[PDB]
Symmetry: D2
Subunit: 196 residues, 4 copies
């Protein structure tokens, strides 16, 4: 039922910021596995739910969150990147950012600190808080998705699982984050922002 989305660009389109090998493995191996495991899990769940098996439903939660979240997180991630990205955003998004973070650079600073501070595997996110009407930074462990676990609407996500950058930046997570700013697709972040 769920499927692996095609990448809107070639695997080597983000060089030299993120090399082709990482993109190929990240998409065709990591994301593909999450989609496949998600469909298997949803199927078992449909089954447990049909016969009112509460125990089975609860036992399947970790697998559904990990794989379901994995699919959601990476799907957004691909659209957040672009060989034509980089620079700074414009319009209302830029204003919202100055408003809520003081300046674009302070925002970069914050999101970078949150991403680098993730203990173990996880994601750094720029999300929108519907209740307050402000932008908000949050970090999620493993594949826990932003909206499903915090209620925030995801605008921009940064994957900090080691498979995201190890082949190229090894243990230096800060180098990875410094480079990713050059390929952020602000046009996509902007429309996600305008949508909510």
């Amino acid at each position: 039922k769920h499927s692996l989305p095609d990448l809107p660009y070639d695997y080597g389109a983000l060089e030299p910021h993120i090399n082709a090998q990482i993109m190929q493995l990240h998409h065709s191996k990591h994301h593909a596995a999450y989609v496949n495991n998600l469909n298997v899990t949803e199927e078992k769940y449909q089954e447990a739910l049909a016969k009112g098996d509460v125990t089975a439903q609860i036992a399947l939660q970790p697998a559904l969150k990990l794989n379901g979240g994995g699919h959601i997180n990476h799907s957004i991630f691909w659209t957040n990147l672009s060989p034509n990205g980089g620079g700074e955003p414009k319009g209302e998004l830029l204003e919202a950012i100055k408003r809520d973070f003081g300046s674009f650079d302070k925002f970069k600073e914050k999101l970078t600190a949150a991403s680098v501070g993730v203990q173990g595997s996880g994601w750094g996110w720029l999300g929108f808080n519907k209740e307050r009407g402000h932008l908000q930074i949050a970090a999620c462990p493993n594949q826990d998705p932003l909206q499903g676990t915090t209620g925030l609407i995801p605008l921009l996500g940064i994957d900090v699982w080691e498979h995201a950058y190890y082949l190229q930046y090894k243990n230096v997570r800060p180098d990875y984050l410094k480079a990713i700013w050059n390929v952020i697709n602000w046009e996509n972040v902007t429309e996600r922002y305008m949508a909510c």
Copy 2:
């Protein structure tokens, strides 16, 4: 779809060990709420699953675990108690206990320590480990059910949420546990044991 099971005895049948007021509130108020909230949650979940909404499925996990677990835990609990309970078990169960804990009294000791040691709300459990083929003691937080979260088959559960004993024993959890041994339905624990 799920329903509140009738108690196999009168509300005051466990006096003076657990008074009638607690039993009445615990069953007709606490357990009833879990069953009702469970049906509402499973329904929303059926809905999220039908349209492949992964985000909604993940957001509903806490409510399904709390209410689904609440229903499962209390349902077992009622059958674990009896106005004719108390004393010690006999047969294979008693042997399994001596085998795995040394003696019946050391077992009581262990399970009591685990129950009293729960930080906040939770349950103390005597469960069966299918893999090892031995009895095992475990404690679960809030309403997290034994089997669904640990894989152990539940044999005997002791509810240590404060609503379990506060009206009668106030803050003295140890007095509550000392009294509950007088109403344990060993015949029920035995058949749960024989079943697995």
Copy 3:
């Protein structure tokens, strides 16, 4: 080293909103135990730290958080209540509240929903976010303290562990929260607010 603070009022001073029995048990039994267990734990920790025993330091974390948090949370709680409290706050605090929540009543609404929504044992909090410079509502499980786990400065806390209200309101948590508004010490919340 740490000690049980005296209550700034008589045990029955909050009647009929919170009866004397609850206040007496809550202070002399529950809080006293947390203080005593905290001193024992800090002592063991001083010891583990002296000989560089990392394993022991990590094993003691749950007990230090539960008891240390228990002491911190209840200490603030006593000052948040007053036989002369109730009504609405005035000055800058009232403005900060209208600003961040729309109105005082919407604020009450929010904090009440957060408190009632705590699964199991926990606290509902009105805190101050130093980074953003705005008021913020948060809920913490068990005795996890607000500042130590979220960074927010605590202004007003509402204890929703069942021992907080069970003797008087039984399972009806909403009745408990409706009554507590009549004894909130706004003068204390205000000065905590002015301090940060």
Copy 4:
């Protein structure tokens, strides 16, 4: 106060099972950082403890567990590996394994499944349960150390953080685990076993 232990062998001594690049990065970069961050954290903690600052003590727990656990876990890991390892264990350890797992191969199977099943970052462990007197398999998230969080005495640990194997086995965690069996230092696991 704490220090980076020297490796008991050359960085390329485990080839071709684990290449030299991984060993060099894993030891001189990853482990070194944990030791350095641990000393900084213990120092801040000594300070918080001296002035009875409970809030600061609690805020430092995540950093102490991650770095303290990181140091403990990797220190054991280095001794668990050897260019002269591989094969099967002998003596009492082998008997304990047959006893508790049926056979050596079923044990390998179990530990492999536990290691591969870790969601995100973590470790698979073969530990000793002092209470029961049996061997036990457990998995821990991130750098949470075995003994400090479960009470089990660590005998053999397998690091499944992606930095452990990504450069060489990429996303195929099962290939990594199949290869690591060839360098397990059973003589070290045996003496850890005899010690407890």
